[PDB]
Amino acid sequence: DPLRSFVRVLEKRDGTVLRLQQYSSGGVGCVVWDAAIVLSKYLETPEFSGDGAHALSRRSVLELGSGTGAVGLMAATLGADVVVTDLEELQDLLKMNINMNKHLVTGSVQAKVLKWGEEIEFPSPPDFILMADCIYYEESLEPLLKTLKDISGFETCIICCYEQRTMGKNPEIEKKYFELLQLDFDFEKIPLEKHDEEYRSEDIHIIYIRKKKSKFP
Amino acid sequence: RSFVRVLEKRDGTVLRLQQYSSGGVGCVVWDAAIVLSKYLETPEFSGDGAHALSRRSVLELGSGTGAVGLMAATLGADVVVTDLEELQDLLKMNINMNKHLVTGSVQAKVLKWGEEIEPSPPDFILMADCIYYEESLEPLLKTLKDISGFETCIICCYEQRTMGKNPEIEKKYFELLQLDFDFEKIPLEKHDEEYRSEDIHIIYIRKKKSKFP
Amino acid sequence: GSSLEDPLRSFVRVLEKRDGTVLRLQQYSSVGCVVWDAAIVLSKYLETPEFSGDGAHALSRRSVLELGSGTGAVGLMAATLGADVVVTDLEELQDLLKMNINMNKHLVTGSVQAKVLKWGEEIESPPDFILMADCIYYEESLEPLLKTLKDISGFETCIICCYEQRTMGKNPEIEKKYFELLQLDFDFEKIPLEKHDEEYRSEDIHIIYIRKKKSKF
Ligand SMILES: C[S@@+](CC[C@H](N)C(=O)[O-])C[C@H]1O[C@@H](n2cnc3c(N)ncnc32)[C@H](O)[C@@H]1O
Ligand SMILES: C[S@@+](CC[C@H](N)C(=O)[O-])C[C@H]1O[C@@H](n2cnc3c(N)ncnc32)[C@H](O)[C@@H]1O
Ligand SMILES: C[S@@+](CC[C@H](N)C(=O)[O-])C[C@H]1O[C@@H](n2cnc3c(N)ncnc32)[C@H](O)[C@@H]1O
């Protein structure tokens, strides 16, 4: 197959390997971003995993802006019931990558369309929402934030990973994301030292986010 | 101590269920709750790996002392035990008495059958000896319909009684149940070897999924 | 009595018409009969533009006989489209049929009444239409049903049979036999799935147009 050379492999701690196609269909290319690799590998760290059953085992996980589905697929191999979401245009790629990794899934995974800011069907709030490199343009602001607010419950653990970009308007977009995020959410950056020892970077950040509860309507 | 029913777990720890609280109401641990609680610990129900209930959402209806829901919480479930307003103090007392064994979570709520529900469908709904009077019919069934989703596993354990109105109630229950739900009796051979009776049945119940709900 | 003011309210099945108005079908009388998925498919098929046709509705001012009516869903839908309907079933279902007529009489633009018709018995002029939903499931659905169908239908009767294909148990054998007997006195054709209501359809639910044969001798 000519497309086999466009597969990106991501090794799991247990020696198995996730294989992510980055092009399909008559459609679109999507890279496996470095931020997705960092987040994926973070999910396999002993400290995130915990003792006994992995932290994600039997938990509901929604990924926003999944792209190749890398992160959500990692979560599915760790026992989560995952929904990977993105634009209509990425659905074929997501489904291909589910089919390439079917044997490694220990929980469940399915692909759905979720365009940020649009009305939701996903009524019950997930245990986790995962995002990798979703903070880079206008939609990453108000529409992404609306989706996060509408979907998350007060117990939802939201984990956001992104690579800091210094080029152009990106520093102002990043600042604004976090300035607006704090209006409806509390957040904290985790230390680099909690990331996977190899798959980490000083310019790639993992942020824990939780919905704020106001006592007044 | 005076009114405690002790229920031993397979792992050798013990659930302690107060059957009365000061100024409040009495509620016995019924035989059906014992049968159902022990059934949850059977090897076939528990399954491989983590127990079938671990990290699963469980709602109990007509919890009384909270016996069955507390058993589930000790098996790793996130449990809500429900009953009438009048049983809330007893439920909270029994949560406190057994919280050192809870590996999931447990909380008490009021849920009077047939009333408007205040959201996500649970993985399991458990009922022990809830089939015995008028409210066990349309109101209970309405609650079951309102709360359950197509993937909810409903387990209903009851003691068959020949006395009084009970045969008519049991009969009408299953007639009404058939409309919106599929159900099957679990053979007696699958109950705990000791904690079982030919007169105590365990029914698995599942909501029928129309293609056009 | 019950704590509930109207204890059987939650056993009413609601079916929305194309114009938004709702049909209400009680499913418990004292004896229960649910609204089967086939009844919903066939009911919504009767409302499709192609079936409805141009001008006045195809059923408008036409005689319709329903066999094995149950709740009366399909016959009631036809009555809301202008047909003069008789819904029929066993004696034990008459109260339910009449209850459901009363609950929907305000939407009736033709007419509807309930009668006993137990299959394979002696009949009391041929209708323009005969409708059947999920009537092929057991021993009597064969010789007695088909005998009634032949006895009542005329050469101009449009017989429409809708059913959900069941694969468990003795069902495929019952289905086989239904069609082995049907071919003897009737011609029939399955209508394409694409002619069914776009929302209210399924690959496993079939609509069959049936017509009484005329031998030359
Ligand atoms: C930079 S990528 C990250 C992909 C993947 N998470 C990774 O880290 O490898 C951004 C992703 O967000 C998706 N996306 C962008 N705008 C969106 C919107 N308004 N609604 C939904 N998804 C969107 C894109 O299609 C793309 O797959
Ligand atoms: C016979 S007991 C069974 C108690 C417990 N499950 C056991 O087996 O030990 C019936 C329980 O149902 C509760 N109950 C009865 N009617 C109820 C209603 N209408 N709504 C909610 N709970 C009710 C009672 O308060 C009581 O705790
Ligand atoms: C599965 S139901 C379908 C009901 C309804 N048409 C629907 O689709 O929801 C079968 C119906 O056929 C009726 N029936 C079965 N045997 C019959 C017979 N020998 N004569 C008349 N009706 C019969 C039953 O009473 C029942 O109402």
Curated annotation (Swiss-Prot), chain B:
CDD domains: AdoMet_MTases. It comes from the Eukaryota. One of its GO terms (biological process) is peptidyl-lysine trimethylation. SUPFAM superfamilies: S-adenosyl-L-methionine-dependent methyltransferases. It is found in: Cytoplasm. Gene3D superfamilies: Vaccinia Virus protein VP39. Its EC number is 2.1.1.-. Changing D83 to A/V: Loss of methyltransferase activity. Signal peptide: none annotated. Belongs to the methyltransferase superfamily. METTL21 family. This is Protein N-lysine methyltransferase METTL21D. It comes from Homo sapiens (Human). The lineage of its organism: Eukaryota, Metazoa, Chordata, Craniata, Vertebrata.
Swiss-Prot record, chain C:
It catalyses: L-lysyl-[protein] + 3 S-adenosyl-L-methionine = N(6),N(6),N(6)-trimethyl-L-lysyl-[protein] + 3 S-adenosyl-L-homocysteine + 3 H(+). Coiled coil: none annotated. It is found in: Cytoplasm. Keywords: Acetylation, Cytoplasm, Methyltransferase, Phosphoprotein, S-adenosyl-L-methionine, Transferase. Belongs to the methyltransferase superfamily. METTL21 family. Interacts with ALKBH6. Interacts with ASPSCR1 and UBXN6; interaction with ASPSCR1, but not with UBXN6, enhances VCP methylation. This is Protein N-lysine methyltransferase METTL21D. It comes from Homo sapiens (Human). The lineage of its organism: Eukaryota, Metazoa, Chordata, Craniata, Vertebrata.
